[PDB]
């Protein structure tokens, strides 16, 4: 719950900064949904959207980036802003299969 959102926020930060992230397949799916959700509000780009995005992402510089940088770039697409690609690689320990998450473009 609060543990998940903390993760999402951490993952989304790195994703918007470097452009890609790698995690487990499940965590990758959950993340893609969270980010698509944030970009949607950024595209709606209003007083209330900016409020909800910040409450979700506890980082101003990023919320700022989303609205005036990432959002404009996806004004043509209407969803599926994030791409998830399953790897042939599995993490060490449990062997859970990995997946690479990145912004479509």
From Swiss-Prot:
The keyword Ribosomal protein applies. GO terms for cellular component: cytosolic large ribosomal subunit. GO terms for biological process: translation. Keywords: Ribonucleoprotein, Ribosomal protein. GO terms for molecular function: structural constituent of ribosome. The keyword Transmembrane helix does not apply. Pfam families: Ribosomal_L17. InterPro entries: Ribosomal_bL17 (IPR000456), Ribosomal_bL17_sf (IPR036373). Gene3D superfamilies: Ribosomal protein L17. Belongs to the bacterial ribosomal protein bL17 family. Part of the 50S ribosomal subunit. Contacts protein L32. This is Large ribosomal subunit protein bL17.
